[PDB]
Nucleic acid binder design. Structure first.
Ligand code: K
Ligand code: K
Ligand code: MG
Ligand code: MG
Ligand code: MG
Ligand code: MG
Ligand code: MG
Ligand code: MG
Ligand code: MG
Ligand code: MG
Ligand code: MG
Ligand code: MG
Ligand code: MG
Ligand code: MG
Ligand code: MG
Ligand code: MG
Ligand code: MG
Ligand code: NA
Ligand code: NA
Ligand code: NA
Lengths: 71, 152, 134, 183, 82, 66, 101, 144
RNA sequence: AUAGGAUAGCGCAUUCGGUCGAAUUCUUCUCUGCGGGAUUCCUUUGUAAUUGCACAAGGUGAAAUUUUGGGCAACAGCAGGUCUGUGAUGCUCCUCAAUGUUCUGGGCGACACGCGCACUACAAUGUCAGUGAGAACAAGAAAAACGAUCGAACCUACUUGAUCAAAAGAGUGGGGAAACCCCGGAAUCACAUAGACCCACUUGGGACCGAGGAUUGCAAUUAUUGGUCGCGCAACGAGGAAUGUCUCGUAGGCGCAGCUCAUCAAACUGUGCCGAUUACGUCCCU
């Protein structure tokens, strides 16, 4: 199974809250943005965060997302 | 049509024909000429201690000499220890697990001695055995005969 | 070999008081007599000038006598000493090759020799136990 | 200049089909040169149905400790088997093999304690036919003067004709007869 | 002990040499078979496979039968067409 | 003697040990026949899937739902 | 003449730091450099039973030790080579100097 | 004076690595470890290697001399590595010295027959673990 | 070809790691310290949602779901094992004809028998005798001694023995190990080898035992271990009730190295080689 743990989901929600303007619907550009705005050892975790960050952006286009606060 | 040259290609060298066909043809040539030295011990001994029975081919020494000559052609500078690996087998140990044994270096040393007397093999510089100019000529000329389907 | 079966073919060949099977190949029919193995039988055929691809039932009476005399005294036919099953007899010191009933007779003498001197190997044989440290 | 493959450069796959309406998508008639490939067939559930049928027959000969992993040996045995099949029937041995596989396994079985009659899925019919034909030939040739390529050819030819002389057909009838009782 | 029965069989008697009667059948009856194999000929002529295979090689050398499938351990023959 | 049926829906693994699959199969018959577009529920032994084909032999018994 | 420097250590980071430092110092001398060759890494393996008494499931511990080796060839006199490799090397790194022929 | 047209490719299967040197020559000449194609045994493995030619057609190998050196692995994995190198060598030669419409019809023909003709199989031997006699087989358990 | 099939070729024809010939250019293959690369990322008139978290097929791709295989692995416990690992230890016992410590010999191997785990087989998908092509992980020599800063221990190639078996025994050289072994000729395997055997406890099987000889060691008898010829007429022709392990480079088969090691692997720890059947489920048994 592929379930995003609370470590990935919390980081992804923080990324969108602070870098919403710089994010996109494409995983590969979002991954590049996330690489220099986050500090972590795991390349796998950053890739997982980029995957869920793109998922949130697609959800945000359709409507509001609970847990995300865009001021 | 079966033996015609493919096209624009002529002649033949070793490694271009069947390995068994060359060895069988070379063994026949050695026996027909009657100049090769055949030790009397080859009539009673086994090719290696890893075997359980003596060779069933009466011309096994000629075949072994022919196969050794081909081996020297492919690996110049090879010794009896190197040839021993090529002619090894899995020895049956009864109720114990079986193991690989290198062939006895005795018959191989004899085979290189016989080929040296014929002038086909000379001791290589800095150890080993190598083919002479005549030995290289003999191998490639016979390979052409195999390709031509002469077979002596 | 496509050779027709001769009228003198024998299915059982008598040789050194052993019933040698005639349907077998010559070297593999000679290994039926005691003291003759596969390696020894091939040498016997070589020294007797008998083709190894023949069937033992086609052997002539003179062929069998030549076979029988080679088995009895292999050394006379240029068979080396290291090829024989009794190279230096502990009682006589002579190299020979036991065959037929003499293989069992000498084995009984070997067992009796070790039992008379009460050697450990002889004692194990009398008690019917293993003697090679098993 | 490219040409369609022929098994052992001798047997053509042109027009190869199974008369059974079922098993049509489970018997692969893809042209191949030899019954040897290194594909990763057992990776998805139904991928083995796409494996060429002769290779499946070759895999059925790699049984017991002395036969495990000898795929080149199985390919050589099949080459002689197909020639014997051609002489026995005067037809394309590839078609005879397909016919034998088409009808070599029961269409109805009994399972489960009271046994109950059930239908057999097309994947299992192809699996069972290959398994039963190879098992019968292997046991027929065990302590026998006849070599396996003769035993395998006889088993396949008889199964292709539906004759009871084949091990696979005999087992199929007994299973189906018992299934009829357990209806 | 003795957990199995074995299912003993009858030991066949196969000639290791040809006689005139069997040789004639090999040169006359055999070249009419559609499928020819050393195992098959051994069964019909009650002869060993070794001498049956040797007899088939003589027939093939005489152009009385043709070699269909050949390997080191397996030989398959068939009758000559017409 | 054997009618060909086509699996159109897999209902699940029935019985103990899950070695039997219950499916709904539509009988493939020519138009105008009494068995045209007749769907029946059967028990299948072996790996099966949707759009698979079965040789039904008899087509009167209907498997109990589970 | 050709001088070969062999760098061997247990720590990969230390062996890379020393090798790069030697390369930088040699580049400042404008001497001919034969690029640092990374020789195959050798692993020492010892596998022992975990228990000290032979009781329970026969579980094993696999201990591994990795050795890293680098070589650099210098076209410089021994006097120049000696003062190239005259810095505070990292602990646990062995640098050997040999003259090729 | 003519320019030398030459490419080099590799094929891999288990631990067997085959390197193929494809050179434009006077005549087609494909050899594996110095052995011509028709001298490779068994015939089953010869047919597998010949698939790299028959699948696309021998007209595309018309003036190419291919020398394949195969090391590692065994009898079968070397044959699969050799045929992958030959098939990949033809693609590389047409990529370097021909246009893209060709080498694309060839590439689709190769992949329509077998993906492994051009793409290496990733499968490798699984390590043995202690308490096991192989990758998976556990020691025999007895209960009394 | 002795009978000789099937299987790529149709500006310059191929071959020779001893031809230990030179030269020039280069990094496709090998080596590797940090990097890159995969994530449910893309697509469904899929499932589901009727928020979501997700799932199933396919696509992309070297790799498609914990990528694969390991290592690590909480909190509570068991009177589980170890006082035979230690100069880890409380209490207790012996302590000069000693339960300390050496030395000699014997034993730990002893067999009516029962059990666990292996090895070898019962043969033709075979055994012999030939011949071919061909892995990977790894190992290698010494003192504050002894001899004249090295050289000898260790592993090996080649040669010699050889004007006649094997196993040996010698000589010379190399290697501190990507340098020598080594272009690591492993065994399953392959052979149109025109080879022998032909269904039999048989040329299957190789237990048991006899005689010669060599080698390790201070010492081989209770065979230390190889090799030769005998013995094979030992059981065994597929194994009752029961029962172990296992889902892909997997099972099974096949050898190799390391480890114990002066000498001795049917063991273990690793390694590569040949390579499947079945399932893609269920809670019936545990
Ligand atoms: K708990
Ligand atoms: K349960
Ligand atoms: Mg054996
Ligand atoms: Mg074994
Ligand atoms: Mg109990
Ligand atoms: Mg605890
Ligand atoms: Mg306790
Ligand atoms: Mg205490
Ligand atoms: Mg202690
Ligand atoms: Mg105390
Ligand atoms: Mg005392
Ligand atoms: Mg003990
Ligand atoms: Mg017990
Ligand atoms: Mg075999
Ligand atoms: Mg038997
Ligand atoms: Mg259990
Ligand atoms: Mg132990
Ligand atoms: Na165990
Ligand atoms: Na643990
Ligand atoms: Na012996």
């Amino acid at each position: 199974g592929k379930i995003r743990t609370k470590t990935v989901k919390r980081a992804s929600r923080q990324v969108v809250e602070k870098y919403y303007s710089k994010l996109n619907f494409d995983f590969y550009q979002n991954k590049r943005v996330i690489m220099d705005v986050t500090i972590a050892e795991s390349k796998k975790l950053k890739n997982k965060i980029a995957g869920y960050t793109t998922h949130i952006m697609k959800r945000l286009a359709r409507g509001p997302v609970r847990g995300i606060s865009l001021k | 049509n079966k033996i015609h040259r493919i096209g624009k290609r002529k002649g033949a060298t070793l490694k271009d024909v069947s390995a068994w066909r060359w060895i069988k043809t070379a063994a026949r040539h050695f026996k027909q000429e009657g100049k090769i030295f055949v030790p009397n011990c080859t009539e009673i001994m086994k090719s290696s201690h890893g075997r359980e029975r003596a060779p069933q081919n009466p011309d096994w020494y000629y075949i072994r000499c022919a196969a050794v000559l081909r081996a020297i052609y492919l690996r110049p500078g090879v010794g009896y220890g190197g040839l021993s690996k090529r002619f090894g087998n899995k020895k049956n140990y009864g109720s114990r697990p079986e193991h690989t044994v290198t062939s006895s270096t005795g018959p191989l040393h004899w085979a290189c001695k016989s080929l040296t007397k014929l002038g086909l093999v000379e001791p290589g510089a800095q150890s080993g055995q190598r083919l002479t100019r005549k030995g290289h000529k003999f191998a490639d000329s016979l390979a052409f005969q195999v390709q031509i389907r002469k077979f002596g | 070999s496509l050779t027709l079966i001769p009228d003198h073919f024998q299915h059982i060949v008598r040789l050194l008081n052993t019933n040698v099977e005639g349907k077998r190949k010559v070297p593999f029919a000679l290994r039926m007599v005691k003291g003759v193995g596969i390696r020894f039988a091939y040498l016997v055929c070589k020294k007797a000038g008998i083709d190894v691809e023949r069937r033992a039932g086609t052997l002539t009476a003179e062929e069998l006598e030549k076979i029988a005399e080679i088995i009895a005294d292999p050394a006379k036919f240029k068979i080396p000493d290291w090829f024989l099953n009794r190279q230096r007899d502990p009682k006589t010191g002579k190299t020979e090759h036991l065959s037929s009933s003499m293989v069992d007779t000498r084995l009984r003498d070997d067992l009796e020799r070790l039992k008379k001197m009460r050697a450990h190997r002889g004692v194990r044989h009398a008690y019917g136990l293993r003697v090679r440290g098993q | 200049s490219s040409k369609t493959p022929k098994l052992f450069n001798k047997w053509s796959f042109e027009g190869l089909e199974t008369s059974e309406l079922a098993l049509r998508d489970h018997i692969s008639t893809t042209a191949a040169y030899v019954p040897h490939t290194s594909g990763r067939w057992q990776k998805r559930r139904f991928y083995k149905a796409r494996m060429p049928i002769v290779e499946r027959l070759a895999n059925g000969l790699m049984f017991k400790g002395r036969g495990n992993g000898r795929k080149l040996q199985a390919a050589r045995l099949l080459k002689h088997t197909l020639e014997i099949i051609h002489l026995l029937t005067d037809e394309n041995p590839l078609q005879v093999v397909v016919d034998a596989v088409s009808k070599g396994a029961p269409r109805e079985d009994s399972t489960r304690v009271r046994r109950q009659a059930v239908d057999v899925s097309p994947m299992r019919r192809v699996n069972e036919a290959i398994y039963q034909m190879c098992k019968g030939a292997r046991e027929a040739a065990f302590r026998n003067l006849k070599s396996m390529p003769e035993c395998l050819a006889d088993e396949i030819v008889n199964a292709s004709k539906g004759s009871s002389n084949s091990y696979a057909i005999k087992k199929k009838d007994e299973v189906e007869r018992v299934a009829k009782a357990n209806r | 002990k003795k957990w199995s029965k074995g299912q003993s069989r009858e030991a066949l008697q196969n000639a290791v040499m040809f006689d005139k009667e069997t040789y004639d059948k090999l040169r006359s009856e055999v070249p009419k078979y559609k499928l020819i194999t050393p195992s098959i000929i051994s069964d019909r002529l009650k002869i060993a496979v070794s001498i049956a295979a040797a007899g088939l090689k003589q027939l093939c050398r005489e152009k009385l039968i043709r070699l269909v499938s050949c390997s080191s351990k397996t030989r398959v023959y068939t009758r000559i067409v017409q | 003697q054997a009618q060909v049926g086509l699996i159109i829906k897999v209902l699940g693994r029935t019985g103990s040990r899950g070695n039997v699959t219950q499916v709904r199969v539509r009988l493939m018959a020519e138009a105008g026949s009494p068995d045209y577009n007749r769907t029946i529920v059967r028990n299948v032994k072996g790996p099966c899937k949707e759009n698979d084909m079965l040789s039904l032999m008899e087509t009167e018994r209907e498997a109990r739902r589970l | 003449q050709t001088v070969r420097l062999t760098i061997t250590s247990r720590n990969a980071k230390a062996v890379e730091s020393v090798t790069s430092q030697l390369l930088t110092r040699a580049r400042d001398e404008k001497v001919t450099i034969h690029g640092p060759v990374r020789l195959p890494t050798r692993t020492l393996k010892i596998t022992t039973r975990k228990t000290p008494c032979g009781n329970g499931t026969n579980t094993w511990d696999t201990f591994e030790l990795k050795i890293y080796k680098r070589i650099i060839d210098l076209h410089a006199p021994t006097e120049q080579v000696k003062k190239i490799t005259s810095f505070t090397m990292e602990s646990g790194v062995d640098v050997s100097i040999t003259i090729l022929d | 004076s003519y320019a030398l047209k030459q490419v080099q490719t590799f094929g891999k299967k288990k631990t067997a690595i085959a390197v193929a040197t494809v050179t434009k020559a006077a005549q087609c000449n494909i050899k594996v470890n110095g052995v011509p194609l028709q001298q490779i045994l068994p015939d089953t493995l010869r047919a597998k290697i010949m698939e790299a030619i028959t699948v696309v057609g021998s007209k595309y190998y018309s003036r190419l001399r291919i020398d394949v050196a195969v090391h590692g692995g065994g009898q079968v994995s070397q044959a699969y590595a050799a045929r992958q190198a030959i098939a990949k060598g033809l693609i590389a030669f047409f990529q370097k010295y021909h246009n893209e419409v060709e080498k694309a019809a060839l590439k689709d023909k190769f992949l329509a027959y077998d993906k492994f003709l051009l793409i290496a199989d990733p499968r490798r031997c699984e390590p043995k673990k202690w308490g096991r006699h192989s990758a998976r087989t556990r020691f025999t358990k007895s209960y009394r």
